[PDB]
């Protein structure tokens, strides 16, 4: 089949499309016919989308820039061996960057391609769930609410089409999609691909594949954007300026004190130059990026597709929870089985599920077709008043006309959605609550225009003037008004979602029929997903459009709704400006009959109120919701496309406990920046404070230059970057959630700092006077004094593990890494005493076994002495 | 509250015959609606085989001809048997009894943990 333009396609009338493509309007193409087009044009994919450029892009990083300038300046200054120190030292941070970016990012396309897109086509004549790849041109695609178009279509069955085209037309108002041929963008016949349904329901005929779509450059060019620096990581970044800026200073005035005060300037400049490689926090922007990427793989290995990275920052700081009770609190497996007729009969609707199997059972009788008529105009207003149909057992557009589709066959009145040809038809909007379509009869044409209408109670009731007794229509009553109120409030309150229905002449002069009871059972996991969150501080609000009733029973059997709590209707938030929904916010636990407007009103307040809202709803509506909340969570696995499009984070299982393990995830990331922070921080204070210390008191330097350099690999390599990797706790699972701002420097976190490196410059001045009494600067005195100052590292870096539970709860290998990087560590200062060109090189004499105890027994000092503050503190919050 | 415990899944060869049944604490006679639920990944629960309350029996369309139901008080058990049964029609088995109901509203619909049957070619 030759391919066709879409302008071609818009003037061409269906028939000649169909018949180029060879394409079959009813059955559709089977494989047969889909092979040789596959072959021909190609799979549906824009093709197929540098490993070395990733790697150079790091090195844009500004303190990594500086580092490369005082390797420079090494090099100028004839130092070979600092220059290369220095270049491993940026090699290895950068090194451990980009392996992690590079995992993170082909764990995130895995999870990605867990999630195919998909589409509904009739190939074989049965509607199958196929993925938008397998497309050939000619297929027949069914198009439903809230659907990505797979492939650029030709509609030749469009009743009221209503697709949204901002993301390739730029207009955020949906246009009305016609099956009518256009002659001569503004095509009204053809659904681009990449556009959403917003509403109705379509089916087409595919007139492009791969490159042949008409706008998918801008697709193209979508893959090229790369995603901004995150946040956290732009402050981060800020804080390693300051931090390299002091130390800086802190340098410069100790070459400053070195010159004035008489010493060798080229030695004084090396020492400049590897403290200023030693303080500057290399390996902050590393841990930082390490850090966000591995919570990035958690996540997905807790099935979660995280499509933006800032989020993973920010579902730490999560504390409120407001999610849609359809959907998301609850499967969306809706249901008829109780229908109240205005006469005042009850009917039992059995079986569940988008099926005809099952029986409406009134006074213990089974009804069928036209047994009971009250029940029939109720059941063929709810048949012919939808969008949505049932195709082979499966559902088409929203749940809820699926109910009433799945109870008309059930009473095999389905027959009668083909017998009414729709004329006019008043489109829903979740304001209005409620939708209507005029019809007229096939058999009998001469039968005036009847409109069918279903929605809210208030809505329908508020349009109808008449109503049904015993098959004769009557004026509408107050009394009958009070019984139908009660009765949809006892419906409400077992946890039925009432729809109204109203079948009349024209409108505002409808007779109500009665009301229906759809049954929508919650989803497994959210009541204790629901416990766990509100046990973490995390509280969860439910925002609906439903009834009150519905939605406090709702929320009552999951937990979210306690006794002693309060409900509000969106009315009553339409009442309430800033002021006073801000105090009301947080004591509401349901929200009712809210638009998506009082939703985003909601979401506004509580953002308001410094709290960092997490939208888990879903809905073809609910998405300026989702991208106006902090962080946006859609279902995978049955969710709409327009929500998985709209949202920041995806659950592939739809599971409520994943937003749980979001947030520990999330507070764990920064609770890793912490401990590097503290570990790098307090060994860089301890050797400025040494250096500062013996040009002040004109000792001789504790430690040269290379042994600086060795001390940045440490302090700021893969030692330290361990800290990064260190593994969750349970704690944040009963932690309070952190506050939005960084706040990284706590006044705790640097009194611990100041107390470590105190100890570590006094052990380590203690040893250079041990064996300074003599008065010979012996280079054994600088190599215990180096080694006393690694190994003090080394047990500070046992220390920075966690802040608060001691080293033996979190365990000492817990952290592999951790442990490799000690042991490496260990091993180079072993190679730097005991290995004679490593001895030239780093002007050190070999040691004996006594004095390594010696150093050993005094740097545990400082472990000591953590693990006492450690133990006081715990006691003290007890 | 009458209890369902499943029973009679297994591994079988295509074309063979396979015994299934969901028995019941209480004794099922007000019972007007009892059925049987295929669950398959990729897919939603489908309708299997049930009968109602006048003793009519319903079939789903992919699987009439080849399953028979039947129920018996005495031994207050459903009981299922397939024959010709194909590799491409296993999944996992729910029975499920719905109760006559007045002045409430909440559905006394009752499902059993299910039995795994899995075919294979």
């Known amino acids: 089949i030759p391919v066709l333009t879409s302008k071609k396609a818009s003037e061409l009338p269906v028939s000649e499309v169909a018949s180029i493509l060879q394409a079959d309007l009813q059955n559709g193409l089977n494989k047969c016919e889909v092979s040789h087009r596959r072959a021909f044009h190609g799979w549906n994919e824009f093709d197929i989308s540098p490993l070395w450029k990733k790697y150079i892009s790091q090195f844009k990083n500004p303190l990594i820039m500086l580092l490369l300038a005082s390797a420079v300046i090494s090099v100028l200054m004839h130092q070979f061996d600092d220059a290369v120190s220095i270049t491993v030292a940026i090699l290895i941070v950068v090194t451990v960057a980009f392996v992690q970016e590079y995992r993170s990012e082909k764990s995130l396309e895995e999870l990605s391609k867990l999630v195919p897109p998909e589409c509904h086509c009739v190939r074989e004549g049965k509607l199958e769930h196929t993925l938008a790849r397998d497309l050939v041109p000619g297929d027949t695609v069914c198009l439903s609410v809230g659907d990505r178009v797979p492939a650029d279509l030709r509609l030749f069955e469009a009743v009221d089409l209503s697709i949204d085209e901002s993301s390739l037309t730029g207009e955020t108002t949906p246009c009305s999609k016609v099956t009518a041929p256009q002659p001569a963008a503004s095509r009204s016949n053809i659904a681009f691909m990449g556009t959403l349904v917003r509403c109705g329901k379509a089916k087409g005929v595919v007139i492009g594949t791969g490159e042949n779509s008409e706008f998918g450059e801008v697709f193209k060019m979508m893959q090229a954007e790369e995603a901004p620096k995150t946040p956290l990581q732009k402050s981060m970044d800020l804080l390693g300026k300051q931090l390299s800026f002091y130390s800086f200073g802190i340098i410069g005035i100790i070459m400053l004190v070195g010159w004035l005060l008489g010493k060798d300037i080229l030695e004084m400049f090396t020492i400049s130059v590897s403290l200023a490689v030693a303080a500057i926090p290399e390996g902050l922007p590393i841990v930082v990026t390490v850090t966000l990427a591995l919570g990035v793989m958690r996540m997905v290995k807790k099935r979660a597709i995280v499509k933006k990275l800032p989020i993973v920052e920010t579902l730490g700081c999560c504390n409120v929870i407001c999610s849609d009770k359809t959907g998301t609190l609850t499967k969306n497996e809706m249901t008829v089985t109780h229908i109240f007729t205005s006469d005042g009969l009850h009917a039992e609707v059995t079986g569940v599920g988008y099926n005809q199997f099952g029986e409406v059972i009134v006074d213990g009788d089974v009804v069928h077709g036209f047994y009971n008529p009250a029940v029939s105009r109720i059941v063929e207003a709810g048949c012919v008043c939808n969008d949505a149909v049932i195709r082979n057992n499966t559902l088409m557009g929203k749940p809820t006309e699926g109910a009433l589709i799945a109870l008309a066959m059930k009473m095999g009145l389905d027959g009668l959605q083909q017998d009414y040809i729709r004329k006019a038809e008043y489109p829903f909007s979740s304001e209005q609550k409620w939708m209507a379509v005029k019809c007229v009869h096939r058999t009998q044409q001469d039968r005036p225009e009847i409109c069918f209408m279903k929605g809210a109670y208030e809505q329908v009731i508020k349009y109808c003037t008449t109503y049904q007794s015993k098959g004769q229509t009557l004026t509408l009553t107050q009394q009958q008004r009070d019984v139908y109120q009660q009765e949809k409030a006892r419906m409400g309150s077992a946890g039925l979602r009432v729809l109204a229905l109203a079948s009349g002449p024209e409108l505002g002069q409808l007779t109500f029929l009665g009301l229906v009871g759809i049954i929508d059972p919650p989803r497994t996991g959210v009541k204790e997903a629901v416990t766990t969150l509100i046990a973490s501080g995390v509280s969860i609000k439910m925002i609906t459009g439903d009834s009150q009733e519905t939605a406090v029973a709702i929320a009552s059997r999951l937990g979210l709704y306690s006794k002693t709590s309060q409900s509000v209707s969106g009315e009553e938030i339409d009442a309430m400006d800033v002021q006073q929904l801000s105090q009301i916010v947080p004591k509401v636990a349901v929200f009712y009959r809210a638009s998506p407007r009082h939703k985003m009103k909601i979401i506004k307040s509580l953002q308001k109120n410094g709290s960092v809202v997490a939208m888990t709803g879903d809905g073809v509506n609910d998405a300026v919701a989702l991208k106006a909340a902090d962080i946006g969570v859609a279902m995978g696995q049955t969710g709409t496309d327009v929500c998985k499009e709209a949202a920041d984070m995806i659950l592939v299982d739809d599971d409520f406990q994943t937003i749980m393990s979001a947030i520990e995830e999330g507070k764990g990331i920064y609770n890793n920046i912490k401990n590097f922070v503290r570990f790098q921080l307090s060994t860089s204070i301890a050797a400025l404070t040494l250096i500062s210390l013996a040009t002040l008191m004109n000792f001789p330097n504790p430690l040269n230059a290379m042994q600086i350099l060795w001390i940045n690999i440490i302090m700021d390599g893969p030692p330290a970057q361990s800290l990064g990797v260190e593994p969750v706790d349970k704690d944040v699972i009963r932690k309070p959630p952190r506050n939005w701002k960084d706040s990284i420097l706590t006044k705790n976190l640097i009194l611990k700092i100041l107390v470590s490196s105190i100890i570590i410059v006094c052990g380590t001045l203690f040893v250079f006077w041990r064996e300074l009494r003599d008065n010979v600067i012996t280079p054994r005195d600088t190599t215990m004094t180096f080694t006393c100052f690694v190994f003090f590292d080394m047990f500070n870096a046992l220390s920075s593990r966690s802040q608060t539970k001691s080293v033996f709860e979190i365990g000492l290998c817990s952290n592999r890494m951790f442990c490799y990087a000690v042991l490496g560590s260990i091993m180079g200062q072993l190679l730097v005493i005991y290995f004679p060109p490593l001895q030239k090189v780093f002007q050190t004499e070999s040691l004996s076994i006594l004095d390594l105890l010696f150093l050993l027994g005094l740097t545990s000092s400082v472990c000591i002495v953590a693990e006492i503050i450690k133990k006081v503190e715990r006691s003290r919050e007890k | 509250q009458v209890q369902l415990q499943e029973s009679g899944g297994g591994l079988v060869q295509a074309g063979g015959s396979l015994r299934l049944s969901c028995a019941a604490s209480?004794?099922?006679?007000?019972?007007?609606?009892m059925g049987w639920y295929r669950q398959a990944p990729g897919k939603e629960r489908e309708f299997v085989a049930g009968?109602?309350?006048?003793?009519?029996?319903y079939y789903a369309d992919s699987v009439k001809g080849r399953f028979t139901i039947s129920r018996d008080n005495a031994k207050n058990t459903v009981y299922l048997q397939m024959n010709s049964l194909k590799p491409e029609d296993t999944a996992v088995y729910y029975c499920?009894?719905?109760?006559?109901?007045?002045?409430?509203?909440?559905?006394?619909?009752?499902w059993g943990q299910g039995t795994q049957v899995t075919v294979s070619s």
């Open positions: 499920a009894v719905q109760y006559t109901q007045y002045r409430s509203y909440d559905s006394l619909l009752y």
């Open positions: 209480g004794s099922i006679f007000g019972a007007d609606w």
């Open positions: 009968i109602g309350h006048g003793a009519s029996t």
